[PDB]
Write an enzyme that holds these catalytic residues in place. Structure first.
Site, short mmCIF file in Angstrom:
data_model
loop_
_atom_site.label_atom_id
_atom_site.label_comp_id
_atom_site.label_asym_id
_atom_site.label_seq_id
_atom_site.Cartn_x
_atom_site.Cartn_y
_atom_site.Cartn_z
N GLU A 88 45.95 71.96 16.88
CA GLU A 88 44.82 71.93 17.80
C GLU A 88 44.41 70.49 18.12
O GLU A 88 43.27 70.20 18.48
CB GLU A 88 43.66 72.78 17.25
N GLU A 129 43.72 62.03 21.51
CA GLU A 129 43.61 62.19 20.07
C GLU A 129 44.97 62.14 19.39
O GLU A 129 45.11 62.60 18.25
CB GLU A 129 42.89 63.50 19.74
#
Ligand SMILES: Nc1ncnc2c1ncn2[C@@H]1O[C@H](CO)[C@@H](O)[C@H]1O
Ligand SMILES: Nc1ncnc2c1ncn2[C@@H]1O[C@H](CO)[C@@H](O)[C@H]1O
Ligand SMILES: Nc1ncnc2c1ncn2[C@@H]1O[C@H](CO)[C@@H](O)[C@H]1O
Lengths: 609, 4, 6, 609, 610, 6, 6
Positions: free
Chosen positions: D410, D419
């Site tokens: 995720e 990220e």
């Protein structure tokens, strides 16, 4: 003249520097890697190519590398290629060559701007600049005419002049107006118009590149240049650029010293310029003689000007002739008050003026500076005697013993009123006789829009700690502006006349028709003053008093540059604002695109009352 | 030499 | 400084 | 609905405020001085007019003045008059009225923008804002349609829709985009097009002015509004503006409560909006789960999204069905590896999927957060048992005991790769089988050019000390942008597919055709992701997953706004850059005008590997 | 030597300046107002005194004022008088005289510190410095011995902190003025000198001039000015600081001219190593420590490394001894010692290895690992042209390189001024897996040393290192490579951190320094000693300094606020060598006698990048 | 902190 | 730069 040789073939490097220094060049633009030695950085087996990649450091000393060699980027390095593999190999090789040049400590590196899109080249350069510590300049090699516009009309089935400037402008804007990125201009056979050359001359041009093919031959067979080329060379010689000579010897009967010899010939064929030398594009804070006390060395450069005080003496001479007829020549004594007498020069000018007018004067020398009162009182004891009365007071606080026939002052700044001549003379106006004269009786300030990348970078470099980060754009700068482009003719801003027998707050709107395309960077402020009837002092570039150097122009910057097209009028607005304690200026550009009001409430620059 |  | 500038 | 009454006649102030409150209005716009009481500041005898200049402070309580009264500037005050005496009197009177409103502590103050040249008004306002300490807001009263275009065609012998926006734009640019200067919009009878209303909706509109003359009359007689006017009221009610009712009661049979009651009626007839409420135009900083350990509350915010984890469970369900046929159901054990297991919602999704798919899995929960490993290991001890193996390691440096059939993560951000999902999944694919699947399978980021003046002021307000004074413009911001205007449709920037079987550095050039005149303020970034074949998660404003509030859009600002006109195309370059230590983004606008390259070398924003 | 003449009587300024420069002085310290012309500023009639207050500025050229004249404050100006009228008049006259000196553009101004309380003097000077623009330096004229301690014992009913008095005066003055760059010392040397540690505290102070009365001079057998050996030793110490000597007083040796007092100082200047020649221009000049691991050095940076022959002589001797030890003479011709030079540079340590194996008559197979891609160019041109197949040049990082075999000796040159601030432990940690189990690392071990120092000039240099767009006090949390020269060392160095190879590199050290003086602590100077092989060492510690070896200056760790220390008060400091996977840094904190903050927490102001 | 932001 | 300093 200082000049260099651009070679793309350096078989052995010490021999090449020898053969280049014998024929008179001062540096050498050479490739740090072999121009045909394409490297691979991503794919095997060519990524793992053995051996050295280039020449060793030790072929020249450190001083040789730091002073004599200008590196070149390899011609195959194409960071903006449409092929991604070529693009990535070219990014990696550009980084490798730039890092090797930083390691060698070269003074400059020569990179080409030969197409419109140079965004990836700009990114790799601006990431090199922000990585590590190094001090190389980056001369971006841009032509006056695009290479597809000076090709021959040979193919049978196959922004005109403002094109490569827009290439350079986009490049330097992506790199955020770096101090370390400049222009190396290529001058071909086809010169552009005169207004294209002016934008070019307002840019950071550190070098000019003259191919040997643009040289035409004379009756004796030597290289010479056309008259338009010679005029361009003279304009570039005013900027003190270096000249890079590229190409082969097209005049084979002579040697390669002949091109350089012609350049030195034009160099030798090329008082305000002598005084201003060393001060070009050097920002200064304007003097504030009312709120600060001046050093004697500050007064010395005032008294170094003979023209201003000769003009003041002429104005006083004519005023004394007017106010006293030849019949009343001896029984009439005219009271003069030199307000802000300095260390002497206006008092001496008044004494000489009354001496050559053959009139009697009673002179008061008012001065608030106690340290200048010391030298005024030594003057009074030693030379002047009882004729001059030295007063140590502000003219706005002084209580005069009697009224004056003429008050003479030199309180004019570079923008004619930024040193509070209106307020000081309005304070001093009450001890003037009702038919009295003020010298100067009139002064006007003039503004013209200017463009200068160098001046903009100096204003940014004026950014200081413990301060608003863009306060530096809200201050006038006394600057001998040199490397700039003026976009329109000057136009009068503010007018003050003395005595004022009627508010020194002013609001002016100035519209400048810009007949060219430019990028507005600031405003230059000049002034004219009428001392007496036809005696004037002017720093306006069309009415400039010759030989007068006591005033450099003012620069009012703007926070962000404003791109201006042809036919677009620039509309700017200036305010002279004041309160009981301070005076300041506010300015804003309102057309073609607005800017913020610069210096609101005098937050970045005031003149202290 | 230097003549145009 | 020259030209009325510090 | 919070609404106000705009009166220009207040005979007694307490009685009028009482009557206004009886009708139901929350504030009252009123003149602090008498609108007809023109004052002289320069010429005697009228300069010395005796008596009080206005009403007493003491006629209302302090809290009444600070919460109930919006002041108005007098209509005779024209600081931009062509007559110098009129404009000096108007500067002085505007200063006097603004200072009296600052003294009374009024929350807001209405000033009119009813002509094109408002530069002296802007200067006097900017000087008031920078003088003294006061916190009143300034609502510039500007119409949707200029009054010379609303006039009837009844004169015998005598830029159309974008006029008053350019008035407001010039005003707010002169005043330097102040936080204290906002818009009060007048909605007249004739209503402009849809794209004019979109720039206006992008502005700091704090109030909307509805004259009673624009109200239609129904068969029962009450005031109503047209359908276009109702649409505009709904779009303004999204912004939570206050409506100001002006003019007199044209429906004299009914009360003045009826105009207010219609707006209350429209108000009562207008999951993601409830979640995002209170976060509109609030700039966070994007999370960095790899470089910073998160908090329990952060993970808790993640796990309150059932749509995303239902989507991951459906993707794992379909992948488990695909990779194991029904006949091989009870003997084939599928190794799933949940990388970055968190506090364990992906592990629970995988277990529920393997139950729903009715397949046997051996699961690994890798997590580098030592504090979320505590939660994972308590889960393992209590619920999961020996099926799940909790690894307290980085997926990049962890040595697996077997290969994985599926790896599930995720690791996506608002821009899908900020990220470091590519770099984490790159080092985590060596323990994936050669026919192994990665969920998410691939992800793309999408960019759209936006205008938002409030967002530009928020980014300016993020100027932090002890850093670069303009480094806040070189950071992405996670922001629930609300008060903005999207200039063009989103286009895909970067795509990453996993597993990568063939460089995570990327370069994109996006050309956005704008069909409207606007002012570019930044780029909003969204993402789409394909988890498994037809299972997707999207935050794009058109393909947005319904009720899925895991990700807000990302915002890349630009340092100075870029004015754009119709038919131009905004060309912008985006680079994903990296080294061994860090990953960052660089951006630059290249058309219509160039901007600097934003964040070179990650000097203002990197993502830590 | 540059020397000046202090005169309190200048009847004519041009004649006096000519006569002063005729006899050899380079400047003239003179009063700008008449020393006895007391002015009144408050009370009539003397407030309205007519005429010029002083002589004109047109008596000398502007360059004469700017270069040749040092102005003096008038002796009657006592801004700290207990009478309020005298105090106000002296404030006004101090301001007037200072402003006239600024108007003249004088390079320096002499003010006296001849009493304990000089707070109002400090305030008027601090207000002058922050008013207007002027560039004059202010030389506080302070005696070595207080005037009340130099008087003869000839008062019958008044018989005669004693030595540390006037330094306390100067310390209080410059502390009130916030350690200004523009305020320095003009030291008066009297007949009786203080102890040697008092003279050390003074020598760590911004002394820009030394004042020598003609009355401290002795007389020859030929009748000439001379000074005692303790005075001559003081003169020799002050000549190191490059102070200017001011001669005051009258010609006390009247037989010969006043030139003789100057001629003796010229004699002593002409009668006072390679390190001192290399270090000139770099004294008290802070520069950043090099970080070769995360910054690629330039070629000119490597050039000054190769310019030191003593370091590479020592490395060659260590490799020589190790090669003799590891190969017996019987196995000489058949044993190949695989050497690995890690961080090979541009060559010089590989050349040292080759010369060592030649003079040892041993066979080596050398690997030259280097991560700098631009020094690999130099290394590979070296290999093609000279080294050949003996040397294998590797363009890799020693920590990620995969060696084809294990080494017998690894040789590195990764030592900084504080021996581990260039990540030699972390780099040699990743270079041990290709070392044989009997393999040797050169350097074998290295220790860092710290000593507390005092220096007002170094403290002001660190303050002047403040940059915008960063923490306003981060400059105090970085070490500086500095040829620290104008400083006072408060105690002997003690060992801080020791690393030994082959082997956690995080360290914690507590050092207690006994203090025998009364000073103000400004920072800690760090040195190192390294053992390459058995008895072959390189050291920059100032007691065991390797002679003529200038590869390393000392390191300096400042502290944000100076810590006043008294006698018998040990200074307890604590150093941490901290690290993570990404960065390595140092932290330090003084814990005795007065705590300071931990400097550089988390490496927020200074890290060394891995 | 909401929407993948602090 | 000298003494291992920049
Ligand atoms: N108000 C004033 N009264 C007297 N002298 C002044 C005043 N303002 C400026 N001057 C002097 O005028 C000269 C030229 O600006 C300087 O000597 C300056 O000190
Ligand atoms: N390299 C990694 N190894 C393991 N978990 C990771 C890694 N990077 C991020 N995460 C985790 O992924 C989740 C979402 O990014 C968080 O729980 C975060 O800690
Ligand atoms: N990890 C490393 N691997 C190889 N060479 C290194 C390493 N760290 C530093 N160096 C080199 O060591 C030398 C230090 O003086 C420099 O040549 C520098 O490039």
């Amino acid at each position: 003249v200082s000049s260099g040789r651009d070679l793309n073939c350096v078989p052995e490097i010490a021999d090449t520097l020898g053969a280049v220094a014998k024929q008179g060049f001062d540096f050498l633009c050479m490739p740090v890697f072999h121009p045909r030695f394409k490297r691979e950085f991503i794919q095997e087996p060519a990524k793992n190519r053995p051996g050295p990649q280039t020449r060793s450091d030790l072929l020249l000393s450190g001083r040789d590398w730091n002073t004599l060699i200008v590196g070149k980027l390899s011609p195959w390095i194409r960071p903006d290629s449409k092929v991604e593999k070529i693009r990535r190999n070219s990014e990696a090789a550009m980084l490798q060559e730039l890092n090797f040049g930083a390691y060698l400590g070269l003074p400059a590196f020569l990179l080409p701007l030969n197409q419109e899109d140079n965004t990836n080249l700009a990114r790799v350069l601006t990431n090199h600049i922000h990585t590590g510590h190094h001090s190389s300049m980056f001369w971006m090699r841009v032509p006056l005419v695009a290479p597809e516009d000076l090709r021959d009309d040979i193919i049978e089935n196959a922004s005109g002049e403002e094109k490569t400037w827009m290439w350079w402008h986009n490049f330097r804007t992506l790199c955020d107006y770096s101090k370390r990125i400049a222009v190396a201009l290529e001058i071909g056979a086809d010169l552009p118009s005169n207004h294209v050359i002016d934008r070019w001359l307002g840019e950071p041009i550190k070098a000019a590149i003259l191919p040997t093919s643009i040289f035409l031959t004379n009756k004796k067979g030597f290289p010479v240049l056309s008259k338009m080329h010679q005029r361009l060379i003279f304009r570039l010689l005013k900027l003190e650029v270096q000249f890079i000579i590229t190409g082969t010897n097209h005049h084979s009967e002579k040697e390669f010293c002949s091109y350089l010899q012609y350049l030195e010939y034009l160099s030798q064929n090329r008082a305000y310029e002598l005084f201003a030398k060393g001060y070009e594009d050097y920002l200064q804070s304007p003097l504030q003689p009312l709120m600060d006390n001046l050093e004697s060395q500050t007064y010395e450069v005032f008294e170094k000007d003979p023209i201003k005080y000769s003009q003041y003496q002429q104005a006083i001479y004519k005023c004394l002739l007017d106010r006293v007829p030849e019949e009343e020549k001896d029984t009439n004594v005219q009271v003069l008050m030199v307000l802000g007498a300095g260390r002497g020069p206006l008092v001496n000018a008044s004494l000489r003026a009354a001496k050559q007018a053959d009139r009697r004067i009673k002179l008061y020398a008012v001065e608030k500076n106690p340290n200048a009162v010391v030298t005024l009182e030594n003057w009074q004891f030693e030379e002047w005697g009882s004729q001059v009365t030295v007063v140590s007071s502000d003219m706005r606080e002084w209580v005069a013993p009697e009224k004056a026939d003429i008050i003479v002052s030199e309180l004019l700044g570079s923008f004619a009123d930024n040193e509070l001549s209106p307020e000081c003379l309005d304070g001093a106006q009450h001890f003037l006789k009702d038919d009295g004269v003020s010298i100067p009786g009139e002064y006007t300030s003039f503004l013209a829009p200017i463009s200068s990348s160098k001046l903009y970078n100096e204003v940014r470099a004026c950014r200081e700690k413990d301060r608003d980060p863009e306060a530096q754009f809200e201050m006038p700068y006394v600057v001998r502006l040199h490397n700039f482009h003026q976009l329109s003719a000057p136009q009068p801003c503010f007018t003050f006349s003395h005595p004022n027998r009627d508010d020194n707050n002013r609001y002016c709107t100035l519209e400048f028709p810009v007949e060219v395309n430019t990028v507005l960077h600031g405003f230059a402020g000049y002034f004219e003053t009428v001392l007496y009837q036809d005696i004037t002092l002017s720093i306006r570039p069309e009415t400039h008093s010759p030989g007068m150097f006591s005033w450099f122009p003012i620069l009012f910057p703007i926070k962000q540059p404003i791109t201006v097209r042809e036919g677009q009028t620039i509309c700017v607005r200036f305010w002279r604002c004041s309160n009981s304690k301070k005076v300041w200026y506010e300015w804003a550009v309102t057309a073609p695109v607005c800017s913020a009001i610069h210096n609101p409430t005098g937050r970045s620059y005031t003149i202290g009352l | 030499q230097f003549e145009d | 400084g020259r030209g009325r500038g510090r």
